[PDB]
Design a protein around this ligand. Structure first.
Ligand code: SA0
Lengths: 272, 57, 341, 225, 232
């Protein structure tokens, strides 16, 4: 491991970080402007703004962990792994909810219970966000006690308990996302296979761009999930030596996700 | 005679439009501006109103 | 015999145009070049009377400046308590397509009309607690664009039939059918005098009509495009028209010439509603730019904007005491705007 | 607080009224709105019969989809101004009096029915509000078009018509001619299905079209477009 | 419009009952409804109120818990279950309708009422006179005195006036003590100095004979005045 590669990958990671920050800050500013304008916005736009604040939290946590684990300047409170883990769970739950919203709104299901639930979901959607936040807190509670215990030992066994807690906690939302994306792709493809007769000029094209957006979303976020799962294991990799390359890899994924959801924000395109 | 008829009504309407004593634009404009300033003070849309007096605030 | 009548008619048009040119001794721009401009006028959304689940087209103000009638495509005419945002009434329209609404001065009745070619007069004050459609008065062969009350027994309705009718509510028949507009009328503002009213037709023209005698007294040829909104200057000697041609023209009756034109280079989009403040110094008009650029009636320079809607401003009403302006937009959100201090 | 019993019960009444409005919206949202447009010469008043003056409502349902069609031919206004009421529909169902190529307007016979229909579809397919509001063409009187196609060609109204006067060819030629007014082929769609009096599959086509449009707007609001 | 009730009659002490109030000729579901208690020779007293949809249900402290009030909207009926009666409740119950929006006239229609006989903090509304000799054509003013100012910051003072014709249900005279009711001669009027109020009558024909009552409505413990009996 040379110094030149270290500084090059660190520069790559900081450019990724600044791009993430500016993208989510742009979404924050434009969404605040839209709110101050009408204060009435569709559910996906506020999913996007909640995901933007989640990206803020995750990225700021990654900044602090990175500089205080590489420079090791006053390693007392900068080990905010709890903050990063909690907000990674929160962003995972937000993204699973995003795919759930895609599955409910787009799909042509017309069941009476389904339709009433769909509307009440639209109306109670901010409260659905709050319920997702409560689920994140309840799910990090075992993680919270695990980190409390591992600090007490500091001040296998409980380490393995924390491993299992974090693993399951962030795999559950990924399972939800994977199921939703699989169902959405299946619905898109099955309606593609017979929508050729019903005209194709922007119909098939927009179905194809929806499938492409789902493909990029699935690839980026699922690969981020494998990345964070590997770093959950930790032992096979080495977070010590290949640190900056790993952080650049992870947050190149998060950059891709943020820019994809930026381009997929109806408020921005309408405003721009 | 339908075209002739409609021409007849149009001509009659125009002839009625001929017999009104219009007023030079300056006089009517001065009257309009006098009315504009006469109620200018008591017009919350233009001039400010006390916040307490504002029934909407 | 058409040719001779047309030639003589052209002769009278030339004569009246010569009169129009002769009467204009000085344009209003010269007179208002010395007046003190009001300045940057900013009004904030005091209340967004949300709750109207569809596209709002018409609003009107009660004569106490407290009750609002807002009509939209959900088949709903909602009567709102402006000071408290409370919904006083929710009238279930019979035809969901609506263009106009009105409030009786006594507050007992509300008018509501649209593409149904009928006007429904609803009686708010009933012994039973529900609002009942007091009278479904019809006869127009063409859609209705504006309805205005006179005395809770006569209502003036402008229709796409190139006509405006004075209906007697009790009898339910049209007493007078003002006819003469080439194109359909999309605007009607009864004068304060309650004797005359102006029709903004799509013939690119406006017309005075006295309500008793029945014939048009003055016709005004204006905008290149069709006139879509109207209001009456408070003095009763003038009125103001807006159009798809993004020009706001103020005419005065004793001088048929277009007294003033308010339009800027950057303005292209059409106008939908035009109203007045009590002093007549403002012409708050709702454009297609999703805003309400106000224009001074005299100095002909923009004084402020009332942006804040995400669609057309369909209806622009003003309080009877000049205390607030309502901007019922296609955004499904009635908004009250009151200037600060 | 500063809210008396009068004002408190007024707020309770306001809440009840809002609840009634949202309960009405419960039924309203389940129904999709279509505007039946086209020259009143023919075609407009027969597909309404196939779907089983003032604004005519047409409430018809197909497989949990409740369509409200609006017939407007009785409005009697040459210049199209009420059209901004319907801005927000999901299907402008335009009927083309296709078979009437040998027929001109009774008033001002120098004006052809087909050219009037073309001007109508140019005004409505490129209207400043009906930008992405997709359009379903029903090229009506396809039986009469098949019968008459060998008798009279399209040269009378079409100065540039060329090829064979066969039914399968002339129908496609006119279909392409009508779809040529599509300034943009991505924001909206001009669906096409020639219909006759006995064609019982038109309801299927209109349901399929509106299904495609609803999935389309759902994709757009979801940002996947 | 009709608001005939039922129930009443003789009740053994400690017993129970259930008043049914039948409503016809108006939209019940949009009308809140109150009960008013009239002791055999005493003045009126508020019992219990239910809003439209039964969102808010209020009771009098002298009857809280022992009574329950409900409204069957689809059948347009008002039910009142009477648990654990006592000597304080032998009275003449009336069934009043009320609507609540800007410009509304609450307590507009009063029902015929049914009487029940049982065998053997709030604002004070006082009518000092309680007996006034009158002659037709004379103008008479009745003053009712409130414990506090009945004026809200919203600009309204919430005083109601009712006329009880001899052997008849109360009839609204003026609501907000400034708004004449519907179907009432213009001679009646009202005006008050915030905490003391006067209902004025220009002329007093035989139709106007009876007992006048004043009512507070700011706070839900609605309290009836002693009224004034009319002597000719
Ligand atoms: O280090 C322990 C850990 C376990 C499971 C999940 C995340 C973890 O740590 C996280 O790893 C990320 C890797 O990119 C870093 O960016 C975060 O700052 C760090 O908290």
């Amino acid at each position: 491991i040379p110094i030149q590669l270290t500084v090059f990958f660190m520069i790559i990671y900081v450019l990724e970080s600044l791009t993430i920050i500016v993208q989510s800050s742009l979404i924050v500013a434009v969404l605040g402007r839209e709110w101050l304008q009408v204060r009435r916005l569709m559910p996906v736009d506020m999913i996007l703004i909640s995901l933007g604040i989640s990206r803020f939290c995750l990225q700021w946590a990654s900044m602090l962990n990175n500089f205080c684990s590489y420079f090791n300047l006053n390693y007392v409170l900068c080990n905010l792994t709890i903050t990063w883990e909690f907000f990674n769970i929160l962003t995972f739950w937000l993204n699973s909810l995003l795919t759930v919203f895609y599955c409910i709104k787009v799909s042509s299901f017309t069941h009476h219970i389904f339709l009433w639930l769909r509307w009440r979901i639209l109306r109670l959607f901010p409260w659905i966000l709050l319920g997702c936040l409560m689920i994140t807190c309840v799910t990090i509670i075992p993680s919270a006690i695990g980190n409390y215990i591992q600090i007490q030992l500091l001040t296998e066994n409980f380490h393995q308990y924390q491993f299992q807690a974090h693993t399951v906690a962030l795999v559950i939302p990924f399972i939800l996302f994977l199921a939703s994306t699989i169902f959405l792709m299946a619905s898109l493809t099955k309606q593609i296979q017979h929508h050729s007769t019903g005209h194709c000029n922007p119909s098939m094209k927009a179905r194809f761009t929806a499938l492409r957006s789902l493909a990029v979303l699935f690839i980026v976020f699922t690969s981020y999930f494998l990345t964070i799962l590997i770093t959950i294991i930790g032992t096979l990799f080495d977070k010590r030596c290949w640190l900056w390359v790993w952080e650049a890899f992870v947050y190149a994924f998060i950059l891709m996700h943020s820019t994809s959801l930026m381009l997929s924000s109806p408020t921005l395109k309408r405003i721009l | 005679t339908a075209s002739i008829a409609q021409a007849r009504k149009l001509v009659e309407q125009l002839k009625m439009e001929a017999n009104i004593d219009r007023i030079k634009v300056s006089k009517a404009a001065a009257d309009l501006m006098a009315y504009c300033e006469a109620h200018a003070k008591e017009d919350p849309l233009l001039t400010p109103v006390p916040a307490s007096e504002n029934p909407f605030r | 015999e058409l040719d001779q009548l047309r030639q003589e008619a052209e002769q009278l048009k030339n004569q009246i145009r010569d009169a129009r040119k002769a009467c204009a001794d000085a344009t209003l721009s010269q007179i208002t070049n010395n007046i003190d401009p009001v300045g940057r006028i900013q009004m904030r959304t005091r209340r967004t009377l949300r709750g109207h689940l569809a596209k709002i087209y018409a609003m009107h103000w009660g004569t106490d400046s407290r009750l609002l009638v807002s009509a939209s495509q959900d088949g709903k005419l909602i009567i709102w308590d402006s000071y408290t945002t409370n919904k006083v009434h929710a009238i279930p329209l019979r035809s969901s397509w609506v263009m106009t609404c009105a409030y009786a001065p006594s507050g007992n009745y509300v008018a509501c009309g649209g593409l149904d070619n009928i006007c429904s007069i609803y009686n708010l004050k009933t012994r039973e607690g529900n609002v009942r459609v007091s009278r479904e008065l019809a006869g127009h062969t063409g859609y209705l664009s504006c309805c205005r009350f006179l005395d809770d027994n006569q209502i003036v309705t402008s229709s796409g039939d190139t006509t405006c009718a004075l209906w007697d509510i009790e009898t339910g028949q049209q007493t007078t059918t003002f006819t003469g507009h080439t194109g359909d009328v999309m605007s009607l503002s009864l004068a304060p005098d309650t004797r005359l009213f102006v029709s903004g037709a799509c013939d690119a023209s406006a017309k005075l009509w006295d309500v008793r005698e029945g014939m048009c007294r003055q016709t005004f040829t204006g905008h290149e495009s069709d006139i879509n909104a109207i209001c009456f200057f408070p003095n009763g000697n003038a009125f103001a028209t807006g159009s798809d041609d993004a020009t706001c023209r103020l005419f005065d009756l004793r001088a048929d010439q277009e007294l003033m034109t308010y339009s800027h280079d950057n303005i292209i989009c059409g106008i939908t509603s035009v109203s007045f403040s009590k002093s007549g110094r403002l012409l708050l008009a709702g454009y297609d730019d999703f805003n309400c650029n106000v224009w001074d009636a005299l100095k002909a320079d923009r004084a402020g904007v009332l942006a804040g809607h995400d669609n057309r401003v369909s209806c622009l009403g003003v309080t009877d005491d000049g205390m607030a302006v309502a901007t019922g937009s296609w955004d499904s959100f009635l908004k009250i705007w009151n200037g600060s201090s | 607080c500063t809210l008396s019993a009068e004002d408190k019960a007024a707020v309770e009444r306001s809440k009840m009224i809002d609840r009634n409005l949202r309960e009405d919206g419960e039924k309203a949202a389940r129904e999709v709105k279509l505007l039946l447009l086209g020259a009143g010469e023919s075609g407009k008043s027969t597909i309404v019969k196939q779907m089983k003056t003032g604004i005519v409502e047409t409430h018809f349902t197909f497989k949990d989809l409740h369509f409200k069609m609006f017939d407007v031919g009785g409005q009697r206004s040459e210049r199209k101004k009420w059209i901004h009421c319907f801005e927000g529909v999901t299907a402008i169902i335009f009927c083309v009096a296709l078979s009437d190529y040998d027929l001109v307007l009774a008033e001002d016979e120098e004006m052809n029915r087909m050219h009037e229909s073309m001007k109508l579809f140019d005004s409505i397919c490129n209207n400043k509000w009906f930008t992405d509001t997709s359009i379903i063409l029903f090229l009506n009187k396809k039986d009469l078009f098949e019968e008459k196609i060998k008798k009279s060609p399209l040269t009378i109204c079409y100065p540039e018509y060329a090829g064979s006067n066969t039914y399968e060819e002339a129908a496609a030629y006119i279909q392409c001619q009508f779809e040529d007014l599509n300034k943009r082929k991505d924001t909206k769609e001009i669906y096409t299905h020639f219909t006759c009096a006995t064609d019982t599959q038109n309801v299927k086509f209109v349901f399929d079209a509106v299904t495609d449009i609803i999935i389309k707007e759902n994709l757009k609001d979801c940002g996947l477009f | 419009v009709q608001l005939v009730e039922s129930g009443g009659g003789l009740v053994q002490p400690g017993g129970s009952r259930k008043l049914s109030c039948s409503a016809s000729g108006f939209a019940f579901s949009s009308f809140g409804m109150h009960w008013v208690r009239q002791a055999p020779e005493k003045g009126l007293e508020w019992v219990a109120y239910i809003s439209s949809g039964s969102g808010t249900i209020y009771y009098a402290d002298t009857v809280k818990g022992r009574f329950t009030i409900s409204r069957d909207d689809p059948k347009n009926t008002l039910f009142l279950q009477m648990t654990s009666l006592r000597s304080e409740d032998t009275a003449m119950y009336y069934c009043v309708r009320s609507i609540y929006y800007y410009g509304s006239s609450p307590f507009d229609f009063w029902g015929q009422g049914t009487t029940l006989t049982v065998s053997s903090s709030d604002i004070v509304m006082t009518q000092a006179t309680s007996s006034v000799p009158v002659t037709p054509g004379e103008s008479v003013s009745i003053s009712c005195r409130s414990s506090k100012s009945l004026l809200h910051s919203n600009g309204n003072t919430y005083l109601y006036w009712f006329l009880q014709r001899p052997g008849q249900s109360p009839q609204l005279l003026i609501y907000r003590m400034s708004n004449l009711a519907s179907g009432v001669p213009d001679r009646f009027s009202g005006s008050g100095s915030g905490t003391a109020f006067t209902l004025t009558i220009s002329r007093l024909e035989a139709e106007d004979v009876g007992v006048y009552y004043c009512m507070q409505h700011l706070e839900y413990p609605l309290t009836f005045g002693a009224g004034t009996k009319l002597e000719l």
